[PDB]
Amino acid sequence: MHSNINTLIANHRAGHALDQAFYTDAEVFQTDLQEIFYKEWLFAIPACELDKPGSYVTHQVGNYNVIIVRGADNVIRAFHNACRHRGSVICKAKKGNNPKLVCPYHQWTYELDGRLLWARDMGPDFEPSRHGLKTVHCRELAGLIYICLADEAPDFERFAEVARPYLEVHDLSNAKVAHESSIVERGNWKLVWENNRECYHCGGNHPALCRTFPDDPSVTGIEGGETPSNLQAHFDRCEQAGMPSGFHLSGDGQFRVARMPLKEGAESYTMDGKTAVRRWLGRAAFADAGSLLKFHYPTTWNHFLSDHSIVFRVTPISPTETEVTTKWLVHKDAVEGVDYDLQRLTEVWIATNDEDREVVEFNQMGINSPAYEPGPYSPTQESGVLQFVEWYLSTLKRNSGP
Amino acid sequence: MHSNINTLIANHRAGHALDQAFYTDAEVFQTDLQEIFYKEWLFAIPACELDKPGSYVTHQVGNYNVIIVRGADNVIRAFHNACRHRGSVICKAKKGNNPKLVCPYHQWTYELDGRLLWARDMGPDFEPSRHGLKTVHCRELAGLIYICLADEAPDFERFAEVARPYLEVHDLSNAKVAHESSIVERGNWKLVWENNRECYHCGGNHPALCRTFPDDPSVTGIEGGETPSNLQAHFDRCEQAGMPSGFHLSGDGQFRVARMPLKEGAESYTMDGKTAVRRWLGRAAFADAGSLLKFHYPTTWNHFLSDHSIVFRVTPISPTETEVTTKWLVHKDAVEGVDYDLQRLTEVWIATNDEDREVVEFNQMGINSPAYEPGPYSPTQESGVLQFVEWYLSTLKRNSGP
Amino acid sequence: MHSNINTLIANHRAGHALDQAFYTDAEVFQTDLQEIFYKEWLFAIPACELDKPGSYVTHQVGNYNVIIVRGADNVIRAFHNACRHRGSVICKAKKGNNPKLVCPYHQWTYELDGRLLWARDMGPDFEPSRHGLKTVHCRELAGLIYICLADEAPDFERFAEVARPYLEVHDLSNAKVAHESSIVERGNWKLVWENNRECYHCGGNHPALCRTFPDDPSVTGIEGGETPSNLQAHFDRCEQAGMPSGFHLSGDGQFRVARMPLKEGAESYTMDGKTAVRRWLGRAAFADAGSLLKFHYPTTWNHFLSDHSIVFRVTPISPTETEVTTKWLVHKDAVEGVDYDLQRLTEVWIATNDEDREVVEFNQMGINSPAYEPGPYSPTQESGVLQFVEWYLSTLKRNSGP
Ligand code: FES
Ligand code: FES
Ligand code: FES
Ligand SMILES: [Cl-]
Ligand SMILES: [Cl-]
Ligand SMILES: [Cl-]
Ligand code: NI
Ligand code: NI
Ligand code: NI
Ligand code: NI
Ligand code: NI
Ligand code: NI
Structure with missing residues (x-):
């Protein structure tokens, strides 16, 4: 299947999802390891x-x-x-x-x-x-x-220079790992990313996360527009208080930082919306600091909050298997049972990860059929997926070429 | 292995079983899916x-x-x-x-x-x-x-026109599935069929079935002769009573119907030989109606009795794995515990399926050896296997060709 | 990977371990079956x-x-x-x-x-x-x-003529199998052999065996020198008493026999060093007869002692899987619970086999990395591994050639 990577790439239908081979073929998977990972x-x-x-x-x-x-x-x-x-x-x-x-x-x-x-x-x-x-x-x-x-x-260094000031807010050298979770998702690594870079599936699939996380496409996605004023007011509120927040997407599409507001009232990714940890990780000036979103392809997405942070790592295993490792970071002196409760801290993202895994797994299973034909991405609801696919194809073409 | 399907087919030794590649090779299996299933x-x-x-x-x-x-x-x-x-x-x-x-x-x-x-x-x-x-x-x-x-x-439509009158006896639109069983047999789909199309192994392997089912080769097999008079008398008895029964094998070998007599006394596939269900599925005029045998390659064999019917479905999974799904059909108003007992209804074919699975699995295991060389089919005891193999090779050649 | 076996063999770096493909590649494994096993x-x-x-x-x-x-x-x-x-x-x-x-x-x-x-x-x-x-x-x-x-x-016959007189000491036609153990090691069959043909890993990995078995390289390995005088004195002691013992390595490297002394005091491979079985298997003249070492590539190494014998069999399963079957042989009239105790007889080599399995498995796992590059064998500590690799490459080249 696919002849070669050049021919597969040249046949991609703009605005649509990837040809089946990208998600199933053993040789394409080896190319993904060799050229990307x-x-x-x-x-x-x-x-x-x-x-x-x-x-x-x-x-x-x-x-x-x-x-x-x-x-x-x-x-x-x-x-x-x-x-x-x-x-x-x-x-x-x-x-x-x-x-x-x-x-x-x-x-x-x-x-x-x-x-x-x-x-x-x-x-x-x-x-x-x-x-x-x-x-x-x-x-x-x-x-x-x-x-x-x-x-x-x-x-x-370009990545480091952009990201360092946003990241320094969270004082991560003085964190500890409060909890680690590793799951194997029965989907291609690209399906894990495509799923991560949209909230089109949120309304139907994430009850606990939707209590705090807006399914607004300007939050998760990549929009060409002037910044919506609710987002800008948050950026300014946080920056006035000394927390870098403004949206930055790298020129080549590899990474993005932005400190986005959460839903009305919410401080943290918890069932009640309140901070999970009483002793905060970093210098957040107030509890409703939103979430610093960071991605860096091909391995990581992250949420850095006022009180704690969650860092995620994607590692491909096979054409239809991908490990996702999630770590919850809290201040090194925060004590479990006093400053935080392990279930309260972790339950939202444990549930959300399993929900994402389910949709990724049934997406892969349908894609396995010879009847699968890629459809169009939602221009407004899946702008982030279009952006990821463009990063992937452009990087594959550059790294493969001379 | 095998170069291509054309060369493999051209090398077949008439009257003998298939070359190892037919039962083991991954590319031949993909050809079987593409050209047959x-x-x-x-x-x-x-x-x-x-x-x-x-x-x-x-x-x-x-x-x-x-x-x-x-x-x-x-x-x-x-x-x-x-x-x-x-x-x-x-x-x-x-x-x-x-x-x-x-x-x-x-x-x-x-x-x-x-x-x-x-x-x-x-x-x-x-x-x-x-x-x-x-x-x-x-x-x-x-x-x-x-x-x-x-x-x-x-x-x-040729299939439908031939089969409909035989099938209508059993009023299958008013059935229900009393029981379903699905087993994975560790044999090539063709070995499941070759096994199904002979009773050469019956004497040594099926105690419960042999209480009711004759291991006469004229019943199971495909014989060129004039019809044996015990078979003809049954056809006439059933047809006089308004149940189509006469032997029909399609010209291309894909399907066959015939309502064959069971052993002396037997009404149904039960340990005691008597009907399993008191409320019969369909219009059988008497309890000892024999079994309407129907095959249609590549997916189904069946037994339709006076009281109940059993329908079987073969689905290939891998070169050495095949699913067999068996469903017992009874009248929709027959009540378990009153009109039939689940164990009595199902025990004979559950045991028979497991017995068939065993012989298929050890046949596959021997075929895996580089020492395997196909032997001859019994002309009288395996006429049905010769007929199946001829259907398979002829269909593969036609569907592959122009 | 490897193009063909000729090119792989021609690229071998003298004195070093094998290229990754020898231990991982599916086609090389099939070549090993076809040309060796x-x-x-x-x-x-x-x-x-x-x-x-x-x-x-x-x-x-x-x-x-x-x-x-x-x-x-x-x-x-x-x-x-x-x-x-x-x-x-x-x-x-x-x-x-x-x-x-x-x-x-x-x-x-x-x-x-x-x-x-x-x-x-x-x-x-x-x-x-x-x-x-x-x-x-x-x-x-x-x-x-x-x-x-x-x-x-x-x-x-060359093998038989050399080995028979050494083997006849142990009267093996009058043995029985006191115990069998079969383990699957997650390493290439060649890694099992390379591991078996050195005691460089002994000090760090075999506490129970090292109580009786010297990690002297002249015992396990293949040395060019004149025989060390402690070895020669043992050969002469045993031969004076009618037990063939002198070192013999076949010209082509396939097999070797030698009756080597054990550590000071030791009679048998037991925790206390004393014979495991009171009724001895064969004609050993005294309890401290050492161990008759025998290998015959590609399938067997063995230890024949005064009281009992242990015979080992290597069978490849896949490029990264190998079965090792170990059998403890005792006199046919020796009764468990009277003449020997099963745990005492078997515990040393059960533990030693598991220890060998561990090192082989983590060796294979490291070799799987694209970063693996074969290093040099210890000239003195791994002379036996160099000898095995030379037998393998020379045999592969001869059996493959004209
Ligand atoms: S609605 Fe998106 S995959 Fe079905
Ligand atoms: S008797 Fe038929 S396969 Fe052995
Ligand atoms: S010391 Fe020998 S493999 Fe590491
Ligand atoms: Cl996210
Ligand atoms: Cl049948
Ligand atoms: Cl040894
Ligand atoms: Ni999601
Ligand atoms: Ni379209
Ligand atoms: Ni049968
Ligand atoms: Ni013949
Ligand atoms: Ni060892
Ligand atoms: Ni070197």
């Missing part, structure tokens, strides 16, 4: 997860597995989780703390910067300098760790 | 399952999923279970009742004839007339629903 | 498992399944487990006893030499002489059964 910057973890020198996590991206580890100098570095002897995984656990990286097979021992310090009985010609752990590009942006698997990484 | 008429359901206007079922055939739904005008129609917006499955459940077909993703709402009645905020250029549900051919034959996935369906 | 001699079972005329086992090798059966004349024969009618498996069970081989589908009945004795109603032209069970080459070597799936088997 193995070339672009990827959101990995909040930095607060690496709490001490020697702290690490491991992270699977396609066929890669990456160790992300905080050094004795407190700098976070990334490496391929693959011993230079016979290839074994070095860190078997998803998280831990170790003063060295020690391969469990034959004990080759690496410094937390990747250098091989000891390898037993390798004989007179062995060169430890040629057998250090292979490196992965790693950046820290206002308390969030990004990685890149390519030999040569694209620019990070 | 996606082109021919397929038995779906008894009409009695759609009990009211708005009633529907869904049905998977290969990668297709079909909604079969009874309209407000009582006409049963079929559609692809795929929304014209972004492709979602519309009906998630295997069965239900709805006055409209409403997509659960963004609520596009279709009439029970497939027309798009409402789609929210699709903008000034949207044409609802171009976004109706895609249709599937659908026919009702004496209370049985058949479908066809091809753009242009083959003739149905 | 379907051409060479394979260890199947100890003969003592077939205790009586009519006794059989079945054995899966890739897509083949083999019946190994003891005849009424006490000769063990092998056949393809595939009926000559429609291909069914004949023997569904892993083991049993039958005076004839009777197909369960339609009862074709074969003699224990494979000849078709009866097939019902096959008509006047049927030739039973042309429908006997297809044969598999089968040899018995001092109580151990080997098979070969090729039309023409390679020489067995």
Whole structure:
């Protein structure tokens, strides 16, 4: 199926959803890994997860597995989780703390910067300098760790310069992960995004979220117009109080920040609309700060509120499988059972994620039929989906080309 | 493996079973879907399952999923279970009742004839007339629903004209499904058929069925001879009493009807040989009416008795997986616990199906070996298998050709 | 991936581990089956498992399944487990006893030499002489059964002549299987071997085994040197007492025998180092006889002790899956609960196998990464791994070539 990616891209019907092969074909999926996930910057973890020198996590991206580890100098570095002897995984656990990286097979021992310090009985010609752990590009942006698997990484600095002032409001280096949830959705990674970038399905599918989150297309979507005055008043209210808020969509479509108002009265994504956490994460001047929306394709969407923040990570597994990992961030000194209640903090987005998963899964299932033919996106209700698809096709064409 | 279907077909050894690739190869399986299951008429359901206007079922055939739904005008129609917006499955459940077909993703709402009645905020250029549900051919034959996935369906009327008078004896529009059983057999769909079209394995494998069902090859098989006089006397007894019974095999081999006698004394497929249901389904003049045998390749075999009927449906899943769905039909006013007992009604064919599944599964497992070489079919004991294989190869060659 | 096996082999970096494709690629795995497992001699079972005329086992090798059966004349024969009618498996069970081989589908009945004795109603032209069970080459070597799936088997006699005198010490025709364990390791079959042919990982991974088994590289490995004097003294002690012991590695690298000393004091692979069984299997002159090490690629490694013996069998399942079957052999008259205790006899190698499985599985997982690059084998600690890889590449090149 599809001949080649060039022909598939050239056949796309403007304003419509993607040809079936984009969502089902095994070769297109490998192209998506090679041209997108193995070339672009990827959101990995909040930095607060690496709490001490020697702290690490491991992270699977396609066929890669990456160790992300905080050094004795407190700098976070990334490496391929693959011993230079016979290839074994070095860190078997998803998280831990170790003063060295020690391969469990034959004990080759690496410094937390990747250098091989000891390898037993390798004989007179062995060169430890040629057998250090292979490196992965790693950046820290206002308390969030990004990685890149390519030999040569694209620019990070345009993104960082735009996003840093919005993100600094939330003091994320002093957060902790109050809760993590990882779900596997039986849909193509692109269907997860298309679903995330519209609220056309909200009225019919999200009771708990719709108590606080407007299904206004100017909030979620990408509109060409002058800013609606309710949005602008919120931007000005927040900026007068020292919280960067104005809408910014990058020129190439990869990322967007905007601090959008919630529904009348609402402070946070909770059943009652009130803040979940009594000790707030960051410097929000008032409880009804709305939500700082941030996306950065292909891996992350996020909501940063007055009291807590929620960071999301998308990792493709197969043409019809995608992991979504959600983390709720609260102030590091906020105590469960005193300053917040775990169920109250998490229930809205746990329910919302499952609802999104359901619609994505039945969308994929219908797309599997040879009868599927892509229809048109709603110009007003799915402007964000059109924008995502344009980012994807344009990026695929550029990264594939010369 | 096999180069192409033309070469595989051209290499078939007359009178022998099929080359391994026919039963194992992934490309041959896709050819079977494309040339047979996606082109021919397929038995779906008894009409009695759609009990009211708005009633529907869904049905998977290969990668297709079909909604079969009874309209407000009582006409049963079929559609692809795929929304014209972004492709979602519309009906998630295997069965239900709805006055409209409403997509659960963004609520596009279709009439029970497939027309798009409402789609929210699709903008000034949207044409609802171009976004109706895609249709599937659908026919009702004496209370049985058949479908066809091809753009242009083959003739149905020769089949219907032959079969209708035999089928009308059983008054199937006034039946109900007393019981349904669906099993996945770990064999190629062709092995399920080859097994169904012989009773060479009966003596060794079916104790409960052999109490009532003769393993005479003139009953199950396809013999060139003049009709054995015990069979002819039954045909005449039944026809004198107004029940069409005489043997008919279609010219192209696709279908066969004949009302065959059961063993001495037996009325029905029960452990004691007596009718299972006190209130009979249809107009049988006497209890020992034998069984109306009907096959129609590639999807259905059936047994219609004096008291009840059993209809079977074969749907391929993978090269080594096949679903067999069995439904026991009784008169709609027959009450479980009064007019019949569920265990008594169903036990013989539940056991027989499991026995068939076992032999099919160990046949497939042996065929998987590179040592497998097709042997000869018994000319007398497997005349029906030879006939099935000839239908399959001839149909594959015709549908593939110009 | 890899273009073809010739190019992959030609690109191997001397002294290093194999390119990723050798351990992951589906086509290379099929080449390994076709060129190695379907051409060479394979260890199947100890003969003592077939205790009586009519006794059989079945054995899966890739897509083949083999019946190994003891005849009424006490000769063990092998056949393809595939009926000559429609291909069914004949023997569904892993083991049993039958005076004839009777197909369960339609009862074709074969003699224990494979000849078709009866097939019902096959008509006047049927030739039973042309429908006997297809044969598999089968040899018995001092109580151990080997098979070969090729039309023409390679020489067995050089192997047999070398190994017989070492093996006869252990009187294996008078053993019984005290215990069997089969585990599926989530690694390529070559990783199982590479792991087996070194003790570089021993210090870090095998507490129970290291109580008795030296991690000396001259014991496990393949060294060019003059024999270390502790090894030679053991060879001479054992040979003076009539037990063949001296090191022999075949010219082509396929097999090796040597009776190696265990650690100070140790008699057997037990937690306390003492013999597990009071009634010894074979003629060992003293309890501290060391272990007769035997490998024969691609299927078997073994340890034969004074008191009991352990025989191991490697069967590939998929590119990343390998079955390891371990059998503990004791004297046929040794009684569990009197002459030995099952836990004491088996615990060391059950634990050791699981430990090996763990390291093999995490080695495979790391190798799956596109970042994997083969490193160098330890010249002194992994001489046996270098030797195995050389046997594999040389055999693959010879069997593939003209
Ligand atoms: S594979 Fe890591 S030390 Fe050997
Ligand atoms: S996919 Fe059906 S309404 Fe959107
Ligand atoms: S398949 Fe063995 S007797 Fe028919
Ligand atoms: Cl969102
Ligand atoms: Cl039948
Ligand atoms: Cl060993
Ligand atoms: Ni949603
Ligand atoms: Ni259109
Ligand atoms: Ni049967
Ligand atoms: Ni023949
Ligand atoms: Ni080991
Ligand atoms: Ni090197």
